[PDB]
Structures are given as structure tokens and as C-alpha cells.
Amino acid sequence: MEALIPVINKLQDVFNTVGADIIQLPQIVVVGTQSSGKSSVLESLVGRDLLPRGTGIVTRRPLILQLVHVSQEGVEAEEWGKFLHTKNKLYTDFDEIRQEIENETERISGVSPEPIHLKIFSPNVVNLTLVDLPGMTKKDIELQIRELILRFISNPNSIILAVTAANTDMATSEALKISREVDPDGRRTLAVITKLDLMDAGTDAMDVLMGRVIPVKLGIIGVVNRSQLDINNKKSVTDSIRDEYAFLQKKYPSLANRNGTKYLARTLNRLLMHHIRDCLPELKTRINVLAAQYQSLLNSYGEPVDDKSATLLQLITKFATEYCNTIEGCGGARICYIFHETFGRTLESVDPLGGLNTIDILTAIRNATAVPEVSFELLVKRQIKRLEEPSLRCVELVHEEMQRIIQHCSNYLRFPKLHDAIVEVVTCLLRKRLPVTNEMVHNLVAIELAYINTKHPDFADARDCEVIERLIKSYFLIVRKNIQDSVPKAVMHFLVNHVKDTLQSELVGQLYKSSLLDDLLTDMAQRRKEAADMLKALQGASQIIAE
Template identity: 45%
Template structure:
């Protein structure tokens, strides 16, 4: 339907405004109906006229006068509570000269309303269904077409009047809501603004002109309407207002005289009101020479001309946008394909969609999808990164000795010994402490599983098969099923991870080649101590140097000799032993048996060292002369004394 409407839009406008309006405005109305049904009004802006004004300013009376029939809800309080899109379509008279006037609602297709009082009741009922019966306001449209030979082709949008104080069920911010609703229409460049202001109020305080000025600051789209000219104060008139001398508008002003509330109560017809309006302007000499600015008839002609001219302005861009949108939609439709009518064909289509979805999911995991993003890791590459980088890093950050102090170790050993002192270090505290540290690996492992689950969920959301665009419910259901499937797989995965950690905690494999036992740990510790202390020979004292002024190497040797002082008064009489021998001696224990080493715990021969063994166990890095040897011995004796 939209394609037919676009193809029927004339490319070149004719010189006559009426024929163009008669051919173009109905096409625009048809497009508006199509977009309203599709709910895509904001995608393409269509030309229309929005009627704005404060509450009880006479907007509804102006619309009724344009139609020539009484069909809108009227009253002293707020009446227009939903936007009413009114499409006036001119029809031809019958050959016998009779007229056929009727209305159609978009929400009641095919039903014609020949009685305009029924149209009023349907508008009121539809408003109450959406906005409630206690003065509530809604932004959902009511679309009404009126076919009559007495109207010109115009599309008008009657918007709720601007109010200040909430009444009934209206929210406290009713004024802000109504202004936001009005701005959503009049801010569009394709929308003309019909600003209605009563003549018995100051034009500078007009809410309609104020909100129109915000949406159209240059005034290229605003038409001013001055109502209630017949109830102005005596001695005043609206001539300067109509001439634009107070607040100028590029499109000018039109003055009208509406039916009063008394006329509505007495059922005075709109036709009689139009006759009375004409008499009013003729009887007022001040309005002489302003015939083109006074009366409903002039307002209808001007609106038609301005709307047609506005359509001529926006027509090229409108047709271009619609053609590009049609091309895009046609490509999308071709990619989606046709819907088979038979059940067998529908089953095959469903199976094809599921197969494509599974292939898309698999290709994203395996990295074979051509549409994968190059800006970030995704799919299987992201899963690999989680395992190899995030998970490994989280494990490396777990310090096995964190929160494990010497006091904890000492307390664990003492608790394991019970009431007696232990000769050997028991294994129970080791297992207790190790289990506690192994348990710390559970949280990083569970976090890794959740990361993988989240990535799989993202992959399932990105596997959008083109056919699924036609079936949003199927797409939603597939997402639910896939999410439940992955969630059901996450629970046993977390349980299995917990079991693995429990298995590692229950059995400590001390037979593993990488496990370091107690004797091996002591041996490695002794080797590290020995390697950190290299043997240093006794340096010769240079001639002419005092002991206090000896080189740093000799002073270091003195310190080592002091540390290596024999326990039982044994003094070396032939030089200083190497550091290795000193360490061997000090580590093996004294001859008194008061101190004992690790080697005595694990068995072996007596580790006591006699003075003879100490004196005979000597090593020299180089031969020394007798003089140097005597000096060294004297020096050592002084040190030990």
C-alpha cells in the first residue's frame, strides 16, 4: 500500500493550487493512515496542520466551522483529551445535487457514520476507553476522516488545550505533559502550526504563540487565529492584531467568530453561525478592507493553500526518503523470504530456522563466522582468553602462603601432638593447613565457569537468523530455551568443580615427583645457607699496617673468627679454619651434649668433634711463611683472649 501511495505522488506540481491539493493531500492522508497502522510515524515526517492553544480558546469550534458540522465534544472544561487527527476530504456532489457527508474512524474500518452526533459519541467513548472518564489525558491518536463536498482537503491535528491546574484524575505535572505532547508534533519541520488565541485576552500572554515560537522561532510555519472577536471589550477591536502589528507572523492572522456556549446549548447549527459571522464582519466598519483575513471561509482557503504549498516544498525530499525506505524494506523482505501456507512447509521452515541457528552458534564458537567483530574478542576466542589468561591469572594471584603465619603453623603442630610432646613433626597439621589453602582455589574456578556461561549467553543472543525477524515470539522463546539450557549446564559444572576441589583436599599425593618432603626441604635449606656463605682464606697482613687499619677482607675474617670461637675452649693453633669447617662444627653441636642438631634426630654416629679433629681438619688456600703464620696466631690469640 505504501508503495502504491508513493508511486502516485506527482513529481511536478501544477500551477493551480486546488487541483494539486485535491490530488496530493489525499495521498498524504493515505500515507498517514498506513504509518499510523504500522506504528512508524516518527520514521517519515508527513505534512499536516497541528492546532494548538490554551484550554477553552475555541480550537474545537474552529474545527467544527471548517467542517460545517457539529461533531466534537464541547463543554466549559477540558474536552480534547486525546490528539484527534482530522482528515477533511472533498467529494463531488451527486448528479441530482444532493450531498453525502459521512465520517470514518480508523479503529472502525468500513463503518460509515452519517449522523455526526454519533461521531461525537464515538470520540467521547474512545477517549474514555483510553484516558478514563475523569479528565485524564492520553497521547494516543484518534483518526477521523470526514468526506463532504463542503470542505477543502486539509489534514488537522486537534491537540489537548494547555492547562495550568490539574483536575480530576490528571497528574500534578499535567501542564508539562501536555506541552511535551504538543511539542512532539509541532517540532517537526513538516508540520504547520495553527496557533489559536482568544481576542478577549492579551496577545502577549498567548500560550499558543509562546509554544509555537519555541518550535518555530523564525515563524515560517505558524498561522495565527484570533477567536471570540464578538466578545471583546467595548471600544476595542482586533484590527492591529489581524494586521500583525502587535506580534508579526510571516503567514499572518485570521479572525473568526465562533458559536457561544449558549448557541451550543440551544442547538444553533454551524451553518447559521457562519451566516452570523459574516453579518458580524459586515456590520463592523473597523474590519473593512480585511476581508481576506476574516471568517472561517478565508481560514479554510488559506490553510488549503499553505498546506499545498508546504507539500510542494517538502515533496522532493519526502519522495526520496520514502523510495530509499522502500528499497531497504524490499531488500529485507527478500532476505527473509516468503511464509509457506501449508503446515508441512511451515514445519520445514521452522526446522530450517533452527538448523541455521545451530550453525550460527557453532560457527561463532569455532571462529568461522564472517560477521564477527574485529574490535574485540568474541565467541570461541573469548572463551580461550578466559581459560588461558583470566583463569590462569586468577590462580597465580592466589598466594599459597597468604594468611599462613608461623603462629598458625606452630599452633597446628601443637594441636596435632595432643597432651604429649612430639619427637617428630606430625603430618596432621600439614594436611590441615594444605586443605585450607587448596580450598581457596574454588572461587576462581567457579568464577571462570560463570564467565564461560555469560559468554555463551552472549553468543546465543548474537546468533540472529534473518528469518527470526518475522517471528519475534519464536525468537523470544528460543532465547528462553537457550538460556535455560545453559543455566542447567552451569549447575552441574559448578558441582563438578566443587567435587574436584574436594578430591584434591581429601588426598594429598606426597608420592608425586614434584612434592618436596621434609628431609628434602631441610637439605635444600642447608644447601642454600652454604651457598650463601663462600669460604674466605686468611689474608696476609701487609708490612707496616696496624691491626685496626687492616683491609676490609681481614676485618671480615676477624668477625668470622669471633663467630667461629670453639665452645669447649679449644683454640686452633695453626691458623683459621675455612668457613665450611666452622659451620660444620657449629652445626654438629658441642661436646657437652646440651645442644643437638637435625642429624642427631634422624640417627647416625656421634657428631661430637674433638680438638684433635678440629686441629687436623685444616685447609689453606695458599702456603704461608713462618713470619706471617706467627703474626696470624698472635692475632687470633688476642682475639680469643
């Protein structure tokens, strides 16, 4: 179980650059009011004053203090430290360690969630790690602090070290109240009572240390640390802890064995140790699922941008098939729709005799004499003329639905330069094709106005205007049937099918030029950077839980 405490410390270190809150890591958080003297508690564990008590300001960041027993095996210093933010630098002067803790706080231009990872090596300490948090003040900043404390203490695997001075009434403790918000029955909260010599009845919690009543299940431990004056005199922590044992032996003799600094360190060391072993089987499982999740995110993003010329070949060739595909089955079917549900409904609604008054028929006849058939060709030749616009209109409707398909596969790339270039290339490609197709359309109608055969199989022959009327409806009907089939077919040849073939390669040809590559492969690369860092932290972490 010796191996177990260091691995969690090693685990925590891996995580600080990137944020440990996503993994429910097993550790103990220390929560107390500034007046509870929680700093003294921590300084009494290490056995030296290494936390700032400086007159000036308060500390704004959680300090993860990892104490590691070193024994056994110029000359070698007995006590020393190293910070994770400094990397390798080894501290032998404890005044500098304290100044660096103070400094790192000052360093941020409020409160901040970035933890500080200080490791202290000493033969006088037990192996134990604790996460100190900014103290409460029983309103703009203090709530920032409470919210931050909650971020830590909301963790399921987080044991709570609740520090309260015996000086006050423990049932009304600000510390005990916040612990209760996340842990109602106090199933994972350990209480610490400082200032035992200030105990009297008086106020509680004299009664809790005796177990009547008990607001937490991990129990309570009493201590007495150095207060200011003795803090004005350099009353060494070593002398103070010695002073504390004597105190407990005379006042409260029957409890000496469940209180004091030496005993508190042993219990926390035992309890931290016992807690991780218990939660470690679920933790391995927990990092692995997360590993796979992050891996998929990286795979879905990445985009490794392996080599720039090669990536363009892969990103744009796929834009070609997301295209030929959809036009050939919005589809693909908006098109058939437009060809067989709308261009049809229109054309069919064109009257074979609209506009043509009886008088107009009579006028054609009069000039014809100056044979009904001659009147007939001129008449019909004006009826067949009203079919071009809808046909032309049809073409436009198709263009519409095609220029719209690209966004349908803009929405189905993250390179603003590349995506924009390709779109312009396609949107423009169609404009080049819109004249050609429109002309064959014009012809198709115009061929009809050129010959008007009467030897057509679907024709019937042939008072006076009575029949002419019948003739025109008859012929126009077949000529419409013609156009209504040939125009859609037309569009498909010159615009739709032309483009499917073309785009496959004119895209690569205008785009695939090495000069423009730097431009196209140019942001939310940070989302990937956030993931690349997390992914890496997890794999390394999983590596550590093994052995």
C-alpha cells in the first residue's frame, strides 16, 4: 500500500496543465474559514512554517501539498522541496518556498482554479497529500471562493477535511455548512477541532469530540497549534507540537490518544491510503472509457494535416462524390420533383387556346384568302410560342436546386479559404453552363415553330372557324407533350450531367496548384489542441496505474 499514495500524486501532477475536474480523482480537500487556523494545521503536519501568513494579502489559489517521507538513504540536506510549475528546481531554503507560494498567487493579474503542486521531502513527515483551499469569511469574492470550494468538494471521491476552531460553536460552522451541501449525511467528511485549550461549556463542540452528537461519520480529531503570540515569537512548530502533547496529557487525559498533531497525521495517512485502494478499481475503468471518448473526438477532428499537397487531394475529391451522389440520389429528387411535379403542372395548365380570340382566327382567314390550313399554321405557330418561358423557367429552377445542393454538403469542411474557394468554383461552373442549356431549350421550342407537320401519327383531319379551332387545340396538345418531355431531358444533358462529369476534375484542376496550397490549408484548431492535450494526459495516466 506504500505504492498507492505516490501513484495518486503522480496522477495529479499529469493532470494539472490540463484540468483534473473531468476525472473524479481520489484526494482530500481541506475546507475552513480563515479564522479557523487551517494554515497552522497544515504547517503542523509538515513541521515547519512554509505557508505565507504575510501581512499584505490573502492567497487566491488551491495549494496541493504533497508530503513525502524520505528515509532512509558535500552533504545532503535533510529537508527539501520542488514545485510542479518550476520544473526541476530543488529548494533547500524554506523561506523561498513560502515566497514562491505567495508569488504564484500574486502572479495572476479574484480567485483562480489553477492548483499549485508543492512537494516537500522530509524524514519528519508521514506520506500524505492534501489540497488546501482559500478560506471563507462567514460578498463579491467570498462567493467566488465558495463556488470554487464546491467545484472541488462536489467530487464523489473527495474526502472532506473540515477545520473548525473550538473557540466558536461548531454546529453553526460555515465550513460544516458547505460540506453539508454536497455531503448531507456527512458520510465523507472528517472534522478537525483546533484551539482545544479554548474549550468550555461554554459552547460545543466539546460534546462532539466525546461523540454526542456526531455530524460526520469519519469522526473528529482535536489539535492545538500555535496562535499569533506565539506566532510573534518564533515558537518553532517542533516546540509547539511537543507543547501540545503535554497539554493533552494533563487537560483531557482520557482523550490524549485520539487527539494531537502526530495522531492526526497518522489517521489522515491511513485514511487517505484506505480511501484510494477502495476507489482505485473504479478509477482504472473510469480513465479508460474517458480515454476512448477523447480518442474518438481526436479521430473525428483530426485532420492530422499530414502533408499539405496530399490533404487537398482527399478533402476535395470527397466533395466531388458528396455531389455526383446527391444530384443522382433535396437529392436528386427535388430535381425529378421539379421536373415531374412542377414544370408539368405549369405546362399542362397552359391553355391550347388562351389569348386566341375568335376574331383573331377570322383575321388569319381573311389574309389567307388575300385554304384553312394556311390560317392554321400561323394560328398554332403563336400558340406553340407560349411554351418557351416555362421551359426556360424550368432550367432556372434546376440551377436553383443545384446551387443549393452545395450548401447541403457544406452542412454535411473547416477551411474558410478552401471551402469558400470550392463553392465559388462550383457556383460559377453552373453559370458557365446556364447559357448553353438555355439555348438548346430555346431551339426545342423554336424547332416546332419551324415545320408543324400534319403527317404526325396523332393527327386528325381536315362551320369554318369551328374546325380550325379544333385543329389548333389538337396539334398544340401533341407539341406540348413533346416539349414537356424534351426540356427536362435537355437540362439533364447540358447542365446536370455535364456538371457531374466536369466537377470531378475541374475542381482538382483549378484548386490543385501548389502555389495556392498554403492558402487553402489554413481558428478552431484549439478545440483539437484541447483534445490532443487531454488525450495525451489520459494515455500517460493509464500507463501509470499499471504496475
